[PDB]
């Protein structure tokens, strides 16, 4: 025919190729080539330990100590309490007002009890504090969705009474609830999709990814960031804006890499390992936030579980139960900022209100990046907005907690 | 509807997402964040020079010296000679046998003259030697395609004589030929596609990419590879296989990064700058060789110009002018290996026949990777096959030439 068309190079902006799966395999190949010797070393050196049954027996030796696993186990009380008020109002008792009050009390207690235990106890590690508060905020969102879905499938039955798949009143079983609580999702649903089998190879690869990226994050921190912080061990709350920026410029890129590894290690490897153990089959925990040419598209695709919980339990109901789309969006912003400063600042016992100010500054930044940049330049603007952006607030919190202790 | 489908995570193999444009913008953002200060520094420090008109006047001060630009300029003699035999047999003279002999003489001279000048001159730098030989092999392929296309469009006219677009005998103009010679293509064609305009912004970005990635390659070499080579300055021709491998394991990853930057800097930035200056509009210089889950698919998409020149001037004619598809493929292999060892080993004056042995070993490696691995594991196997693969042969040549001189 004609050996020469009129086209564009694949790497060009106006080409629209977008088939770069292989820039991922390249990053995997290079991470492995660079960390595989050390990973086999640390795996034989740490995997040879007797961790599994010794740490559990040690914790069982002194309950009421190690208050973070104590909190995580006590969360079952709130789980069972929600299940009880549900299964009790499922038949005859607790007219909707009473059940809604019991559930609101249970939810507010899920939120305010672990915060209290964390603040009013000195023997609780901050990483364990964070695990307790994150488990309890996950449980809070899960039980909020539980209440909402059961209320819906109960109003529907009450209506239709005067006109394989499990119907409404037959899903209130401890098996069901405690499968939902460990499901990689925040939106309750009768008849979750299911995977055919367990795929031992997939689960093994997920566990390997978790171990590898854990060791990689440890490398990143201990060899790029802890040295840089220890060069000038001065808290951010006392430094000035100039010195703060001079230090954050040195700390940003390692912090960004650590956050990318958190995202992968958690929203792909950990959540897929969980969803594979208990066959879950949905497995859309994230969407392509990396090719997000705006901050608004970034937030709507980072953390798909939380976002769809938001959109169908906190934003759509506000539009229904009221008006002012603007007020719904600002309420979503408020809730997200509250949960961020509650996850980052209650474990570290700080309240400098930095995560909140960063979450705020995301707004003018979002308008800026949405208005000025487009396409791949907008995507690069979003990548900048993530390198400094919000993760720098969490970095400031952790930097202050590091230099104020060791 | 139903908030939970049955799907897979985007990073999973069996998902088939492949929209990772944004893992590229991330690499650009990070390369810029890591090298921008130094790049502005080296640009003000090197761009302030009076390079443009001083080096040309200095070369014009002593022609017959600097033999590499002398060779590149003398290539115009072969260009004009091919154009002359064409435009002369275009009308009445040089029956096809005579014209074919003149063109074969011209081509063999294009190949054997710069090799001779390079070998039989001591004052020629190896980088300039390589530029001369690469310009002359590009000219050879271009003129081969020129001969073939004009022969075709002349046989067609001779036939049809006894039954906007430019017809055959009206394309033989110096403007046309010397546009073709500088076109980013190896396949001649009457009526090349054309771009509408010059797009000063695009050309500026291409020049910026060329400068940036040149400085980046200089950084890579001088700060990752020259130190590593100077730690043990021992030629590869004298070391044993064990020590050779011990050193190549240390040299591979920097060599691989340098080769990726060569690929980009040349097959995208340089070729697009050229194609934009002289509006060319075709601009398919490469295809997605990065997501190539086999070595055979890699070769067929790395270097699209050379590959399509191959497929429609050296492989399809052999299938036509003969048989034995196997023999056509092995002839393609032979020609590629010859040109590789002629580009890498004539400038360095070495003839250890290493590039040839690597090009050979690509064959069993290609069968291996094609048979055993699939999908993303096949792609990772190809990435391995590029990290050690063929570029290590060129690395061995350059390492020997470095340690044997400085
Ligand atoms: C004693 C000798 C030590 C050195 C030689 C042995 C090294 C062995 C390496 C072990 C590391 C294994 C864990 C790495 C972390 C990643 C785990 C993994 O398989 O990740 C997978 C990613 O893998 C890929 O993408 C393709 C496979 C990559 C294999 C790369 C092999 C490199 C060479 C190995 C040897 C390295 C030697 C280094 C010497 C300096 C998960 O894949 P997915 O595409 O996301 O989807 C799969 C589910 N659909
Ligand atoms: C104030 C002057 C500008 C900022 C400082 C200089 C930065 C370096 C300047 C130039 C080197 C650029 C090398 C790569 C060029 C990439 C061109 C481009 O548009 O990339 C695009 C993607 O990349 C971008 O958009 C990058 C935009 C910049 C992001 C990085 C941030 C720059 C500003 C802060 C710099 C701070 C440096 C100091 C840090 C301590 C699209 O890709 P493509 O394949 O190139 O296609 C374009 C044509 N269709
Ligand atoms: C020491 C290791 C050096 C590795 C250098 C090559 C790797 C390039 C670096 C980062 C890759 C960034 C990828 C795009 C980020 C957005 C998407 C994302 O979340 O990516 C995931 C996040 O991963 C990352 O961000 C990787 C972080 C890289 C940390 C690099 C540490 C370098 C340490 C210093 C090395 C010094 C070498 C010697 C210097 C003289 C990666 O996903 P995957 O495992 O590839 O998925 C495949 C599943 N089958
Ligand atoms: C504390 C530790 C020591 C200090 C930090 C040291 C950092 C410097 C060390 C190593 C980095 C050396 C350079 C690695 C990347 C080589 C260049 C490269 O891959 O070029 C790319 C070539 O890519 C291809 O041919 C596709 C296949 C390979 C995928 C690209 C991989 C890029 C890796 C980026 C790593 C990011 C961190 C770099 C840090 C300087 C050109 O792509 P582009 O510019 O993104 O184009 C899109 C816009 N049109």
XYZ file of C-alpha atoms in Angstrom, chain A residues 248-249 251-253 255-257 259-260 289-295 298-299 358 361-362 365-366 368-370 373 375-393, chain B residues 22 24-36:
61
model
C 11.282 19.233 53.361
C 12.973 19.624 49.992
C 12.868 14.817 52.677
C 10.195 14.923 49.957
C 11.402 12.391 47.380
C 8.778 10.375 51.537
C 7.094 10.148 48.145
C 8.698 6.797 47.389
C 4.086 6.577 50.119
C 4.013 4.909 46.711
C -4.977 7.580 39.815
C -1.498 7.739 38.318
C -2.787 8.967 34.964
C -5.014 11.511 36.664
C -4.761 14.889 34.968
C -6.460 16.816 37.796
C -6.550 16.646 41.561
C -7.022 11.889 41.723
C -9.123 11.907 44.873
C -2.760 20.455 53.922
C -4.580 23.706 50.624
C -5.490 20.796 48.358
C -4.201 23.609 44.459
C -6.931 21.514 42.851
C -5.066 25.755 40.077
C -4.029 22.461 38.489
C -7.469 21.999 36.954
C -2.505 22.491 33.112
C -3.208 16.348 29.682
C 0.256 15.127 30.553
C 1.216 18.492 32.002
C -1.810 18.256 34.259
C -0.687 14.773 35.227
C 2.784 16.072 36.036
C 1.147 18.821 38.086
C -0.720 16.137 40.023
C 2.504 14.221 40.547
C 3.990 17.389 42.001
C 0.822 17.786 44.083
C 1.574 14.351 45.518
C 5.293 14.837 46.053
C 4.715 17.883 48.235
C 0.932 17.894 48.564
C -0.676 16.009 51.450
C 2.008 13.390 52.279
C 4.262 16.192 53.501
C 1.821 16.856 56.335
C 1.622 8.413 34.126
C 6.049 7.854 32.306
C 5.064 11.315 33.490
C 6.254 10.166 36.897
C 9.679 9.273 35.542
C 9.848 12.641 33.799
C 8.800 14.482 36.954
C 11.373 12.638 39.028
C 14.205 13.003 36.513
C 13.474 16.725 36.400
C 13.214 17.062 40.175
C 16.524 15.252 40.530
C 18.519 16.902 37.732
C 16.927 20.297 37.130
